């Protein structure tokens, strides 16, 4: 029948829920209750980066942990030397509206994308000193939400349709297409082992894919509202998820189950960016109420507040060496907290 | 000094970049970003091409440039996205105006146009952003009301209980029974406009035909009023 297999799907959902419950023996609080607190954490804006004209949406640290590319609505990607507060490059974009910004691990390319349905790849290191667009990846029928670099020749893009796409830059065509979402994907994070990646969509669900055949491994559904941020644990076997429920949820891949929820009573604003620390103990989430919160990833305790911002905090990213965390807000300000 | 020669030259490069940023900040502040929305039948694509005389396959944003009285605008049309606009529309929290174009020729699916306008109006991000509503292709409405094939009362029951508004200023050459339906649509949209306006934003109704030989001066005046109210809000107390 047309509705016959719906019952089978519901039975499978009940079976996976029962499996998750069976694997659920003790919560993370019950296991980490005997661990000393991280203490009261204070960080100050060591360097604030001025120069953007409009709201900053996206940022991404480089591998060297010194160069920082930031994307703003004026149509500009500025590359900052965070140590000296300089501007290495000021790339002017074709489309003023940009949602995502990436920085390749080799430091040769920066990827931008937005409501133009185009992932533009800019070659930083060229014989001519000007940064020229390498290639304009096209084939997405929706706004690009998160572009991330695998290597110098591959790039994973999560867009405004219910699809993610892995592109080979040289050929210019979609190497593979990941489908299975029923809403627009808004964030994307790649595992450290450059083999898996989790995508968070507006379905209140985060799906873990595998970039070798293009089929999803597991799906995690614990949220109520849409998902705006996602970030793997440094270990690579857990990932965080930021939503508009004013809750940040840490899931684990091996147990296929919710691990912990971070949500305080006086927080009713959504989360725009989530990033783990190098040790994974600090989960930094930039909320809509003009500030950021540094949760203890193993105690669900608000163990730090980062204050200075005049508008909505949009992007938030830690360095590879864990020295500093950079938060870019809608008031054209990047702040490097340490 | 205290820093090497290469760092001096890097600081000079940063200064040049900041100079370019200062130069194009003037262009950014002078230009008034405008959002453009409407259904498929609404002739926004026709407008954004008919105003050009006086002044990629799956691309998302189409940009139109035009200046009136040495004041330059930037209209953005969203063309290749999904039905759910809940997420990307927050990128237009700082646009000067929203131009909602409604096809008044077709009587069916006017209720869904009303619903779309209501969703635009009550959006959290779109609060404090006004709307320059354009009831486009009035020529087709005038032709159809004289055609006699279709009736307003079939789709809307309150038309019979609606006399012409006293503030109407129609051209005397048109049939006085046409302006009844012509202003009924405006009243229907203005009820949604005034339901929850409350002073942060207002709707600016207009009637636009196919070409009209001019459509940018209305936007000029309306945006002047919008920016004037925005500036006055700094003294409002």
């Amino acid at each position: 029948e047309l509705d016959q297999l719906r019952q089978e799907a519901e039975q499978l959902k009940n079976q996976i829920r029962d499996a998750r419950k069976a694997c659920a023996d003790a919560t993370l609080s019950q296991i980490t209750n005997n661990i000393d607190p991280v203490g009261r954490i204070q960080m100050r804006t060591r360097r604030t980066l001025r120069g953007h004209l409009a709201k900053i949406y996206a940022m991404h640290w480089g591998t060297d942990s010194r160069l920082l590319v930031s994307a703003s609505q004026d149509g500009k990607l500025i590359i900052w030397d965070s140590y000296t507060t300089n501007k290495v490059h000021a790339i002017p974009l074709r489309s003023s509206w940009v949602m995502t910004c990436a920085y390749a691990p080799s430091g040769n390319y920066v990827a931008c994308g937005g409501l133009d349905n185009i992932c533009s790849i800019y070659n930083l290191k060229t014989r001519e000193g000007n940064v020229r667009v390498s290639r304009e990846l096209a084939g997405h029928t929706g706004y690009l939400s998160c572009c991330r670099f695998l290597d110098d020749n591959q790039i994973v893009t999560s867009s405004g349709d219910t699809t993610c796409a892995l592109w080979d830059i040289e050929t210019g065509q979609q190497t593979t297409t990941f489908t299975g979402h029923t809403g627009d994907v808004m964030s994307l994070s790649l595992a450290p082992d450059t083999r898996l990646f989790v995508s968070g969509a507006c379905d209140a669900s985060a799906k873990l894919w595998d970039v070798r055949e293009g089929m999803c491994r597991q799906t995690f559904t614990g949220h109520e509202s849409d998902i705006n941020a996602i970030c793997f644990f440094p270990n690579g076997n857990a990932f965080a998820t930021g939503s508009d429920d004013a809750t940040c949820r840490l899931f684990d891949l091996r147990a296929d189950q919710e691990l912990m929820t971070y949500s305080h009573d006086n927080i009713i604003c959504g989360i725009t960016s989530v990033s783990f620390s190098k040790s994974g103990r600090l989960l930094l989430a930039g909320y809509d109420d003009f500030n950021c919160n540094v949760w203890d990833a193993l105690k669900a305790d608000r163990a730090g507040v980062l204050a200075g911002h005049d508008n909505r905090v949009s992007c938030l990213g830690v360095t590879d060496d864990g020295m500093a965390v950079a938060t870019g807000s809608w008031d054209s300000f990047l702040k490097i907290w340490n | 000094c205290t820093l090497s020669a290469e760092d001096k030259a890097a600081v000079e490069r940063s200064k040049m970049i900041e100079k370019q940023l200062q130069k194009d900040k003037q262009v950014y502040r002078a230009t008034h970003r405008l959002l453009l929305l409407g259904a498929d039948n609404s002739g926004k694509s026709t407008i954004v091409k008919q105003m050009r005389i006086y002044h990629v396959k799956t691309s998302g944003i189409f940009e139109t440039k035009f200046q009136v009285d040495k004041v330059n605008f930037h209209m953005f049309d969203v063309g290749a996205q999904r039905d759910e606009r809940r997420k990307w529309i927050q990128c237009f929290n700082d646009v000067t105006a929203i131009i909602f174009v409604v096809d008044s020729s077709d009587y069916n699916r006017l209720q869904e146009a009303l619903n779309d306008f209501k969703s635009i109006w009550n959006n959290r991000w779109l609060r404090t952003i006004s709307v320059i509503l354009f009831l486009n292709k009035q020529d087709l409405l005038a032709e159809k009301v004289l055609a006699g094939k279709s009736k307003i009362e079939d789709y809307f029951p309150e038309f019979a209980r609606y006399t012409t508004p006293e503030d109407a200023t129609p051209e005397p050459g048109e049939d006085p029974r046409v302006t009844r339906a012509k202003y009924f649509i405006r009243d229907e949209f203005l009820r949604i406009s005034t339901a929850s306006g409350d002073g942060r934003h207002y709707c600016y109704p207009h009637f636009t035909c196919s070409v009209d030989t001019e459509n940018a001066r209305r936007i000029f005046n309306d945006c002047r009023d919008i920016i004037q109210r925005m500036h006055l809000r700094q003294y409002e107390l």
Epitope: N86, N130 | S4, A5, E6, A10, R13, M16
Partner: single-chain antibody, 233 residues
Amino acid sequence: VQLVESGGGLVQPGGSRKLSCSASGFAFSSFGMHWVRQAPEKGLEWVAYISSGSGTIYYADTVKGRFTISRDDPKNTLFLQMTSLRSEDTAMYYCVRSIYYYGSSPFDFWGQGTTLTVSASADIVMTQATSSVPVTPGESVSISCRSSKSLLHSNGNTYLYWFLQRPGQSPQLLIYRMSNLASGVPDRFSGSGSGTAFTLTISRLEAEDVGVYYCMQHLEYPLTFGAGTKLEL
């Protein structure tokens, strides 16, 4: 990218001469320009430098007032006026490209050069070995240089540059900051230093590596070159 120079020839002493460098193939606006002399038999010596925007102009002590530099950006050209050209100026001139930011590689491209012949100071002096090192192909060369001042700035960069000049074209960059390799040179080259003494090691010698190897410091202006160490086959 190419940098073609116009000028040069026989000039009487005390005269004036205008030399131009036309840059075709790259963004001339974002790049600093340098002028480098080379005597008919001796080595190199820095002359003048103009930055992006003509806002930071430097000269060597020996050319402090005699020469003046000027960049015309719209047509992508760099001129210099030479006043009171004495016999000490009978050197070939090179229009050297440069760019400065984090990770940048200054002194990338060198123009072919024009021959200008004239008829009849706490600088960081850099010293190399004798300009005669007998090396055969397939072996490892261990050129060495010494600096009068430690080039390790507080940043962590030793502003050292090693260049190669074949008997033909203009010198090309091999390594910058004593460790970083140039864009096009092979991986056979390497550089190791401690702040005062530096070594350029070629782990494998080929027939195209014959030439004269030149040193550079960049801690502070003026820029001192050194005599140069020559490899012979």
